[PDB]
Write a protein that binds this ligand. Structure first.
Ligand SMILES: O=C(O)[C@@](O)(COP(=O)(O)O)[C@H](O)[C@H](O)COP(=O)(O)O
Ligand SMILES: O=C(O)[C@@](O)(COP(=O)(O)O)[C@H](O)[C@H](O)COP(=O)(O)O
Ligand SMILES: O=C(O)[C@@](O)(COP(=O)(O)O)[C@H](O)[C@H](O)COP(=O)(O)O
Ligand SMILES: [Mg+2]
Ligand SMILES: [Mg+2]
Ligand SMILES: [Mg+2]
Lengths: 447, 444, 444
């Protein structure tokens, strides 16, 4: 019959500890808090750390059963608007993105105390980072498996988004691949529709894929969308895609969730499939700059659970983006050590513990005119996806795919002579179009 | 075929359209860019969540666009109505609904904000979903508890307790009056509390508490994990220990994994409580995200016996009128439209059995009268800190909450006005129950 | 590149290097051959357990060698410290550590004698290991025994006893007062006593003693076999017969088979006793082999609820100073360095649960006062010959050992100094326990 305080006390007297120094085995989270008026910054910040850790809204008698200072999180520093919170390594399950997200962003977002809250960044310790498998193949194995070096790998998204049948899907796929695009892909909403059933789409396009390979001499592919209602169907389509001879599968890793994505990733590696990830539904999180989760937290989670490719967004396309923000996200995927850059959105350093890099994928309303801006931001090791910029050509997919290939290859070659891309890209493209008719129509169409 | 970018307003906007009974209707509260009209923005969402793209493609002529394309048929100044043909969606997959409607259209340069308010699932599409395994009525029979809201509590602190101590806290709550308890949403498998020890320990407490009480008890074991196979392994372990219940975080785990776990859960004869963690990343702000009524619809479609609806008077933010609509949207067979409660569309549930709503948050005894007013008797009340925060331990806290609920319900059944007489009912009950007396004089 | 043979010192000896928190530090006791400097031998062992070889190869330039090479950073005259980076070792596998650290290095001509004294497991690498399935705390609840050492005993003779007679000795010892018994390390399945019969007969003896004594008994059935498939077949048969325990010779079976049996034991819910047979060939000599503190670290990581820590006062050798170090290396969450206790490095156990250290050998009642002093309340005292060697049988021998330990621990709990009053305490116990008298006056 032990006795305790049994009251209601502020969160900042047991969860705000400015003198704390974070360990190298601690999870560090940067939160962009907006408190309810009257409530102080340092009190709402302690609320976030309390309810992503052992805390609650009252003293409980169970607090004396176990030591609380060993496991409790604590907001160790506040820079006015950004509150830094340190989580012990003992609070998280080994090798599960679900728990690092069930706890950190579970209940802290819907509190009355905080009017709005954003998770700007997060430092994953090397101790926690090593319990994760990471990408199956990474960039370097990917390039060798495709036998393509020194060039941003191309790609298209077969349009119309929905409506095409399996026979008509495969003929468009063959047009893009024969045109010069290194790869195509299913659209994110095309799974098993009554007009484009998956068991027929998988069989049809791979005949188109294998036909284009025998005629061009290069190695092509097609990111079959294997997302489905459940993990069982997701694995069944992964199995069928492998035995058909495909090198690729695709998963909407956010709509399908992270547990299903991790389950598919293990099956995909066992079948020797390079797994492309689509970030659909990410814009619900990372759009508003005052609430949600920044993408670079999801970019860290993807590489942590394993994905050969992912969309980082295009800055100059038809979807929102920031150039400084994207550059940080690109190096969070492609590099091994990422020093903190305040001007590039990063708040912490990142030791990647030998985990292998991820291809950044630029997708959106990008045509030949975006190539000079696309090459500079991403460089050689990236994917350029021309969905509308290939089929939208005034002479079909094959003409559009060739023009896109010429534009990307001319600029990248031009970068080798030291020519300044951001000052001479227009003239470079005009010089290329002076001898490439397909690029001529594309340049005199979009502008 | 004429190449070139054309305004979206000419093809994917159609105000004179009358939606078929088999369409998938959606309501978007669009906030467009300056200089971009609502008509352009509304057609942008409908086109880009459907057959459309950012330009004109030669492959448009290959099939019939009008058969499949979405279209906006009504704009109420700020909210845009969009109709989706039934042939665009896979039969029984929440993921395709998510990856099509709420997948790509939110992150446009020309849409400063976009919130999916409500969407109407046609009966034809609804017939391909399994629905909740047990539902409200079968659950009440299985527990053998009728005519009152069921009580629960989150074992606290959230993390830190060992398996031995966790089962000791669980025993005190269940012995003290609570019908069920639950693992907290972040307690999956940690070094201080591994899952194979916690499952075996708290199930011993559940059986010990049940035998010494005479009532069926339960504990929502958290089978959430980092993979579908791991969760199915954890669900299987809980099943053969004799557990009635499991618990999955249906949003952080995902929807494909949630559907996989639901199918396995019904095979083992479990009752799958669902926790809505991370939902506030979506539904908090009023100008961006997805309203929880849409996420509440989807959960019932795929199947879940419980779901958190959000207590109105607790510590978590949540509206009162909108929560009433959600409670009707999860329990009732037919839900007519009600602009007061934010229900844009009329929803027919086509025989899908209902879902227990769960009210959890910073609630205590003082919130019992208001909670019973809102949720009636077919709901769960969770007192995480309102049980363990009692000045005399969990057994007293559980008794205080149990006495508070049973007293307020009895007065409501006797015809008293709960909203006006809650304080009087609670005082009259504390007049003969000390545990409730100490609970009230401590809080509020 | 320059091709040829080069001294090992030039590249793999870095006295200025500062070890990282993610490095794998080892302490090698080197005895160089007459005519080679100590650092050259220290550099040689570092290179031959890492990216190095005996000649400069053209393929070294293909990689950043300095990111992977192991280097010697401190020499203490005769002990060498080597720092192994984290990238060289596969996660979760003990076998890869021994393939690198204690592989080819022990056999080069330059280093005549080499012993691995201690090694530091970084927290980053340590986290990728499961640890003991149940540990100390959970097991005590599983047996419902607290506040005293747990008493067991090997069944003698080692080999020869038939299945029926073997279960008769087990019944006497358990009925007499022991908490567990155990199979002997070399009794897997022999023509005179097969495992199908031994497992079935023993589990009948355990249950009969468990029912008549009122407390929970057990028996560490040996599931060791020549293949992991056979071991798992025996592990499952022991599990469905109701046994609490299984026993594996974790050194003769091999670390891979041990990791496989440990994973299956946790799934089946079996406590896993580990026997260190063949460890002596490693750790007996003071100038060659592997110290048992390294094998104690390796065991706790890969898993195991018990390990034979060795008794100081017995027929088996073993120091006293190092024995306290190992017992702390198993049971404590953090183990600070102590050069007088043999520990070279600070060890952080990253939440891995502790392990019972088991003391066995040629011990009897006269050794109990010193045994309860070295270990304390958390250890197993195995009386193989001290239980059946009693003149009046094994039932009387079990009682004598049980009384001797429980009297000593109760005398410690009231302030008496055990090392000074062991004889007096044992005589006081013997003046009211006749069984203890005959054990005292036969082995005095
Ligand atoms: O759905 C689409 O619109 C695309 O197929 C582009 O088609 P177009 O190239 O014809 O526009 C891409 O998946 C989105 O841009 C994804 O954006 P993010 O990569 O930022 O997720
Ligand atoms: O984690 C918690 O805080 C709780 O256990 C409440 O325990 P207390 O009762 O001790 O606060 C609930 O799961 C969340 O509040 C969920 O809220 P929502 O239903 O809005 O997700
Ligand atoms: O084989 C034996 O001798 C024992 O059964 C003891 O029997 P007695 O009690 O009759 O000696 C033990 O297994 C060893 O002593 C263990 O050696 P270590 O402690 O070195 O692992
Ligand atoms: Mg797309
Ligand atoms: Mg909770
Ligand atoms: Mg032996």
């Amino acid at each position: 019959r032990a006795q305790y305080e049994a009251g209601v006390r502020p969160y900042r007297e047991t969860y705000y500890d400015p003198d704390y120094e974070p360990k190298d085995t601690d999870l560090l989270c940067a939160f962009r808090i907006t408190p309810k008026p009257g409530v102080p910054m340092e009190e709402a910040a302690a609320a976030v750390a309390a309810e992503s850790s052992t805390g609650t809204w009252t003293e409980v008698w169970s607090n004396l059963l176990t030591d609380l200072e060993r496991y409790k999180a604590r907001c160790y520093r506040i820079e006015g608007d950004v509150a830094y919170i340190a989580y012990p390594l003992d609070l998280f399950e080994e090798g599960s993105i679900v728990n690092i997200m069930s706890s950190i962003v579970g209940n802290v977002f819907g509190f009355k105390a905080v009017q709005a809250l954003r998770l700007e960044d997060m430092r994953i310790p090397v101790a926690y980072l090593k319990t994760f498998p990471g990408p199956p193949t990474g960039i370097q194995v990917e390039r060798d498996r495709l036998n393509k070096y020194g060039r941003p790998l191309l790609g298209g998204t077969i349009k119309p988004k929905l409506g095409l049948s399996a026979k008509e899907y495969a003929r468009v796929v063959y047009e893009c691949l024969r045109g010069g695009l290194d790869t195509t892909k299913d659209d994110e909403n095309l799974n098993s529709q009554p007009f484009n059933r998956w068991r027929d789409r998988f069989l049809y396009v791979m005949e188109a894929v294998r036909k284009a390979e025998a005629e061009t001499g290069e190695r092509k592919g097609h990111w079959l969308n294997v997302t489905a209602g459940s993990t069982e169907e997701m694995l069944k389509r992964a199995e069928f895609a492998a035995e058909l001879g495909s090198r690729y599968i695709m998963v909407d890793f956010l709509t399908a969730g992270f547990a299903a994505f991790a389950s598919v990733r293990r099956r995909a590696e066992e079948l020797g499939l390079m797994l492309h990830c689509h970030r659909a539904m990410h814009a619900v999180f990372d759009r508003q700059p005052n609430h949600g989760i920044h993408f670079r937290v999801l970019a860290k989670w993807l590489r942590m659970v394993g994905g050969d490719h992912v969309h980082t967004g295009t800055v100059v396309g038809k979807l929102e983006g920031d150039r400084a923000e994207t550059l940080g996200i690109a190096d969070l995927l492609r590099e091994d050590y990422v020093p903190a850059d305040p001007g590039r959105g990063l708040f912490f350093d990142q030791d990647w513990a030998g985990l292998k890099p991820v291809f950044p994928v630029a997708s959106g309303g990008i045509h030949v005119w975006h190539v000079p801006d696309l090459v500079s931001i991403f460089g050689d090791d990236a994917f350029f996806l021309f969905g509308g910029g290939t089929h939208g050509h005034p002479r079909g997919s094959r003409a559009g795919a060739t023009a896109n290939r010429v534009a990307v290859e001319a600029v990248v070659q031009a970068r080798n002579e030291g020519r300044d891309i951001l000052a001479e890209g227009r003239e470079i493209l005009e010089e290329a179009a002076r001898w490439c008719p397909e690029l001529r129509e594309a340049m005199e169409l979009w502008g």
